[PDB]
Amino acid sequence: TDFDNPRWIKRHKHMFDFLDINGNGKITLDEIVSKASDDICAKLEATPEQTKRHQVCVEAFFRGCGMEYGKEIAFPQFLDGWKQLATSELKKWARNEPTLIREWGDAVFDIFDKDGSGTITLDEWKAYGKISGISPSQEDCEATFRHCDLDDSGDLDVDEMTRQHLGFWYTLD
Ligand SMILES: [Ca+2]
Ligand SMILES: [Ca+2]
Ligand SMILES: [Ca+2]
């Protein structure tokens, strides 16, 4: 609906080329899970059960885009699959059903919440250095946090964490 907005194209090309480990111009579910799941869960020292839950959510999202283990797909076919999925997930949201992004969101939240508190604080948030994996100054970090904390509660709930961490896949601005 707004998934055909031309601004979406450039963003998606850069992400595709980053997930394409061997640089051959096509991606598999093998390459995606390694970059988007194996790396983060090891970095944050998640438990085996936590890691397994995260992997299930990542496999579900990308299979909905048309991906499978051992199957090579180029950019034009990948983009069309994502459009199809984003449309059908918009309708689920409207029918008061749980979506694939919400389910992936809960799995991520459990890993970052090291004590048992049910909110994410600044010390917990800083533990992961993002996918590009290069750290800016301590001062840019702390202002990015304040920006993500929409109300001024001093911490992050599930809706706030999900929008910053996985917003790339469903919203342009
Ligand atoms: Ca490849
Ligand atoms: Ca906490
Ligand atoms: Ca908050």
Side-chain angles (χ1 to χ4, degrees):
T1 308
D2 197 43
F3 302 121
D4 266 299
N5 194 293
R7 305 172 53 209
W8 270 120
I9 303 163
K10 182 192 169 63
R11 298 185 178 223
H12 273 304
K13 279 168 171 175
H14 277 81
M15 181 67 81
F16 183 104
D17 292 337
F18 195 67
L19 301 172
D20 177 23
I21 299 170
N22 74 1
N24 80 340
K26 316 197 188 221
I27 58 172
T28 52
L29 193 54
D30 312 67
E31 288 179 327
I32 293 156
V33 167
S34 166
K35 274 259 189 173
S37 184
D38 289 332
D39 283 358
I40 179 163
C41 294
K43 218 268 202 280
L44 291 173
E45 304 204 344
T47 62
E49 45 260 70
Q50 282 172 341
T51 299
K52 166 151 110 60
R53 182 203 190 168
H54 191 269
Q55 177 180 138
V56 163
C57 295
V58 164
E59 287 165 338
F61 186 85
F62 295 97
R63 263 173 193 132
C65 290
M67 310 287 106
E68 194 41 82
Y69 284 110
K71 179 186 191 210
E72 300 210 294
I73 310 291
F75 185 78
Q77 288 65 53
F78 170 87
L79 180 64
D80 277 342
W82 172 85
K83 286 179 178 176
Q84 264 218 340
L85 179 60
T87 296
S88 77
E89 287 295 290
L90 181 55
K91 302 193 229 259
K92 265 156 91 184
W93 173 83
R95 300 194 308 261
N96 265 321
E97 295 188 63
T99 58
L100 297 176
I101 286 293
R102 177 52 199 263
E103 283 155 3
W104 188 1
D106 289 330
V108 172
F109 201 83
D110 200 55
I111 291 167
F112 278 88
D113 187 20
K114 287 305 188 163
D115 53 26
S117 75
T119 59
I120 314 300
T121 46
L122 186 60
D123 53 315
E124 294 174 326
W125 193 73
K126 272 170 60 140
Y128 178 62
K130 317 281 179 307
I131 63 124
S132 78
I134 295 133
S135 318
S137 91
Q138 210 186 281
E139 287 161 78
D140 292 323
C141 275
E142 291 185 59
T144 288
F145 182 89
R146 297 201 292 270
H147 194 67
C148 297
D149 170 44
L150 292 159
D151 72 17
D152 293 286
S153 82
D155 49 17
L156 317 171
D157 53 60
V158 68
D159 182 42
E160 292 167 346
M161 184 69 203
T162 295
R163 202 170 155 270
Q164 167 268 318
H165 191 89
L166 302 170
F168 171 89
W169 295 111
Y170 69 88
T171 183
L172 212 38
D173 281 294

